[PDB]
Amino acid sequence: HRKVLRDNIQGITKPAIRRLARRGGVKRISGLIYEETRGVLKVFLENVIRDAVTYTEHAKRKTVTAMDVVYALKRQGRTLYGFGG
Amino acid sequence: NIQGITKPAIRRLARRGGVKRISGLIYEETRGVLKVFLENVIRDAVTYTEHAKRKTVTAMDVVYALKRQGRTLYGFGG
Amino acid sequence: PHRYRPGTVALREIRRYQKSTELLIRKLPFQRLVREIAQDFKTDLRFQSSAVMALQEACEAYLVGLFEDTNLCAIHAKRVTIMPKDIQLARRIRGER
Amino acid sequence: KPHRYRPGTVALREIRRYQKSTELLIRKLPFQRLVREIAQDFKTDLRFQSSAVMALQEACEAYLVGLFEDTNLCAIHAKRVTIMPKDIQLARRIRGERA
Amino acid sequence: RAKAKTRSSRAGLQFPVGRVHRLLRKGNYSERVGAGAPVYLAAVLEYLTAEILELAGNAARDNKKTRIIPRHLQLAIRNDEELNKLLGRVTIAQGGVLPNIQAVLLPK
Amino acid sequence: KTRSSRAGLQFPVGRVHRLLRKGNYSERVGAGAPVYLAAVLEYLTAEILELAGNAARDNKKTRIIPRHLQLAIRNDEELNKLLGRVTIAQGGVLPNIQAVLLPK
Amino acid sequence: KRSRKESYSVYVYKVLKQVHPDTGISSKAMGIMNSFVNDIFERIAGEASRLAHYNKRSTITSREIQTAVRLLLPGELAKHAVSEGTKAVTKYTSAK
Amino acid sequence: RSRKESYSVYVYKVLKQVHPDTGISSKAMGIMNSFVNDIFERIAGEASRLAHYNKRSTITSREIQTAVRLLLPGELAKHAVSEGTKAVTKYTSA
DNA sequence: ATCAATATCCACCTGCAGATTCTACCAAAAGTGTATTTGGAAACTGCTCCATCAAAAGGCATGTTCAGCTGAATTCAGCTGAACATGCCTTTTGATGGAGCAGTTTCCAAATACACTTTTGGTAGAATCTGCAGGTGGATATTGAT
DNA sequence: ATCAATATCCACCTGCAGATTCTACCAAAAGTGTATTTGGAAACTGCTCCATCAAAAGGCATGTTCAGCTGAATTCAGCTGAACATGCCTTTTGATGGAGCAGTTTCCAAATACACTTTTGGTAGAATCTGCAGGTGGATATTGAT
Ligand SMILES: [Cl-]
Ligand SMILES: [Cl-]
Ligand SMILES: [Cl-]
Ligand SMILES: [Cl-]
Ligand SMILES: [Mn+2]
Ligand SMILES: [Mn+2]
Ligand SMILES: [Mn+2]
Ligand SMILES: [Mn+2]
Ligand SMILES: [Mn+2]
Ligand SMILES: [Mn+2]
Ligand SMILES: [Mn+2]
Ligand SMILES: [Mn+2]
Ligand SMILES: [Mn+2]
């Protein structure tokens, strides 16, 4: 990534979180929801990326493929349609 | 029959669940819930019974049924 | 005439049953209901003793867990009394609805 | 006037607008960095197929939208219209994500 | 020898029976696969997809589009009590959600 | 002269190996797979019995019963999570009352 | 020196034309369909595999597929699938 | 006799190693039996899929390990991965 | 918060009933010694993609100002739900039988696996076809202030 | 009870990125001809399951009372939405390079395939002991009076 990647969870802006809550039908949002959502999202991604990477290392590859991600999502009971090629 | 699950019985289950006060509408709501539970499981249990060409529902049939429903049970053969 | 205050006995009951592990629903009533339900799917069926006990262990466990979630929903709404509304929210979120 | 909408009207306009569309609500690049950063901490020098990141973004957004749905039901259950941390906690607890 | 007749044409299906049979043999599901199994399965798959394309086609038509897209599939699936049940733990990429605003949120 | 003793285990390497090939998991099963698998099972079992053994001790029982297993399991965070969707017949629940429910 | 990957795409397209002669499908939509066919396939074959196993049989037959279908699919969707499945088998065995 | 087999002897052996003074009721043992079968299927099952995804026909200790890494939470995984590789080595040594 | 007067828990104890543990014997499995295959790993090598960076444009994130109206606090009592003493009967539980049926064996006709060979249906680019994304405008609601 | 103010639709158009077709091998079905495996079709067996039949002992269904929780009705300090001006940095396209999937070959360490021999693990009565049922006696609490 050339430049060190740091503190990117802050890339998930207040507005991007607001649009997500809207789609989920939320009308009013407390001020503390933003950090909480960042904390929950991080846990969600770590859990999935972890399993995905494990499939990658196991295939002795250096490239995380959509399949690795698809298989990891399924393990978490989070099945995804559209990326099996 | 569903009425066989009495009020004091539902109270007991809620107690183990940590519930201290109970609305009177709860007992019937709980019987409805319980019914759907037994149906979903017994449906599959019996289906396992019928595939094995048996007339007798075994503990395993039930165990496999609980497993499919994500309610894995331990102590009855599986 | 001695008379405990409302809640004190309910609490004493909570400690009692959370400490024990026996089935809380009467045997025959339950068994009878299981057979009845079973009839609506397959006919003239026989049940193993253990099969009915297995279903009963699962039910109680299931209702107990549901009541725990229901309780959290009641407490979340500033109440201490569970209402149908609480069981409904809990099942909604569990994906049972 | 100057014309000014009442608090909630535009919020409602936005709800209708996003429940009607399907585009990703989080920006691409920023989401991409987050994924590479998190992954970087598990195994260094990993590469990613463009599709891998897209799959992750689709899954995360669908997950969050759904969480907000449940979270909203919790807030409403407490006679509120505003979602708060307690709502996301109650929902994650009931869902069994943090029982 | 006799002219070739595909198992799909014999079962009167559009889904590949030979393909499915191979997939079953090589998926380590059992030591052996019966002749009827791939037919039955290949037919159920065809039935389920024909069943979702029906609903998605309509949704696409309700939106005056002649091409089915992910959103049409979501609408179809989530608006059908049963399909939704079946795909309750599945997510359709680029599917969005069903419009639904909790009544208590509407202006009073 | 059994494989279990050759791996320093109590759990059945031979039977684990047989369950693996008969289970329709893959056309072939390597030599070390059963060993490794038997080991993990022995480790998980030891882990639970250890704690359940304690619970039985603190209850003054010489025999472990379901209650003890359910206690061992639910009070340990990782085991609880491993068995989050499992139910232990005759295990009951962890005593626990929500603070708002207590008087005074 | 080719790398050819199989898919359910042509079959899905033939079925789409049957139910909607005037409709087409975006490749992304086709991606959802292919994911769907593989998901159900595995869910069904999986349940069938266990069935035969619980019953000590080494062969998965149309009977195992059928009960798996009754186990995985909700109500009406199931009766329907059973109909199509049974129909296809009887027609196939009669070398029809 | 045929009838059926369980893990009873083995579970009783591990118990004696950790609590020589302790025993186990019939039901608790029934529970351990279930437990063992359950974990077994989860790992064998995950190992099967792992092997299939990479187009491998044989399931080795490498697939069991990754399966354990995927199924066990944190520390439980670390200790299981150690006991496993540990057992392989000994088995392979003598 | 104290006293007093109940009311419930909670060890601890004894006498056994009945779970466990302990013994002794096999069928069923695992272990052995040889003998032969073969999945897949190591060694290249073609060439897809993926990592990164450059530029220009402009879609969006940010910080700021205000004040609408939502969450949080409170108060009050109507009436729901808990605690209890009663009286009744449904659930326990204890036999006794009869038999509906899981469980097994021995065969064999019917169904599957497999190596070899034909015969396409499928798939990967090219070569065509075209929806409908983006743009434009008036027509229509939908608000919010008067 | 309106009307500027804005946002939301609806219908129309066009050409180019994204589907659909058209081509042509060719991987992989399907057709043959054997070589195994099976699923049961009968015929028998001990069982676990229903069926009744019959005391009765908790447990539950009821009817009273009334403590105190759930909601309704208010109040109002601030948080959080609505609008704006800024100007940062995400999007879009493409260019470079070369990291690393993927495709092929070659060939052993490792896995399968028998033929037998050893060793287990499952069973079921016998021989232990360990909880359990009841009974206290003494903590621990509750609840009402002051
Ligand atoms: Cl309610
Ligand atoms: Cl909060
Ligand atoms: Cl078949
Ligand atoms: Cl191995
Ligand atoms: Mn049609
Ligand atoms: Mn080879
Ligand atoms: Mn309010
Ligand atoms: Mn009052
Ligand atoms: Mn052709
Ligand atoms: Mn448009
Ligand atoms: Mn040989
Ligand atoms: Mn022995
Ligand atoms: Mn006692």
Counting H and I runs of at least 4 residues, what is the number of helices of chain E? 5
What compounds are bound to the protein?
A: chloride ion, manganese (II) ion
Helix content of chain E: 40-55%
Alpha-carbon distance between the two ends of chain E: 79 Å
Domain tally of chain G: 1
Q: Report the count of strand segments of chain E.
A: 3
- Largest contact between protein chains? E-G, 60 and 62 residues
Report the principal-axis shape of chain E. Answer: elongated
Provide the CATH topology of chain G.
Histone, subunit A
Structure summary, number of beta strands of chain G: 2
Largest sheet of chain E: none
Task: Please work out how many helical segments of chain G DSSP would assign.
Answer: 4
Oligomeric description of these chains:
heterooctamer
What sequence of helices (H) and strands (E) makes up the elements of chain G? HEHEHH
What name does CATH use for the topology of chain E?
A: Histone, subunit A
- SSE order of chain E, one letter for each helix or strand: HHEHEHHE
CATH homologous superfamily caption of chain E:
Histone, subunit A
Task: Describe this structure in a few short sentences.
Chain A is mainly α and 85 residues long. Chain A is built from three helices and three strands.
Explain this structure to me?
The complex is a heterooctamer, with two copies of chain A, two copies of chain C, two copies of chain E and two copies of chain G. By secondary structure, chain A is mainly α. Chain A has helices spanning 14-23, 33-58, 66-75; strands at residues 28-29, 63-64, 79-81. In chain A, helix 2 (33-58) crosses helix 3 (66-75). Chain C has a single domain (1-97), classed as Histone, subunit A (Orthogonal Bundle). Chain C has four helices and two strands, in the order ααβαβα. In chain C, helix 3 (49-76) packs across helix 4 (84-93). Chain G has 96 residues and is mainly α. Chain G is globular and about 45 Å long. The N and C termini of chain G lie far apart (40 Å). At the E-G interface, helix 1, helix 2, strand 1, helix 3 and strand 2 of E face helix 1, strand 1, helix 2, strand 2 and helix 3 of G. Strand 3 of chain A pairs parallel with strand 3 (90-92) of chain E. The structure holds chloride ion (4 copies) and manganese (II) ion (9 copies). One manganese (II) ion binds next to loops of chain G. The structure holds a DNA duplex (146 and 146 nucleotides). Chain G: Glycans are attached at residue 83. Chain G: The modification N6-(2-hydroxyisobutyryl)lysine is found at residues 5, 14, 17, 28, 56, 79, 87, 91.
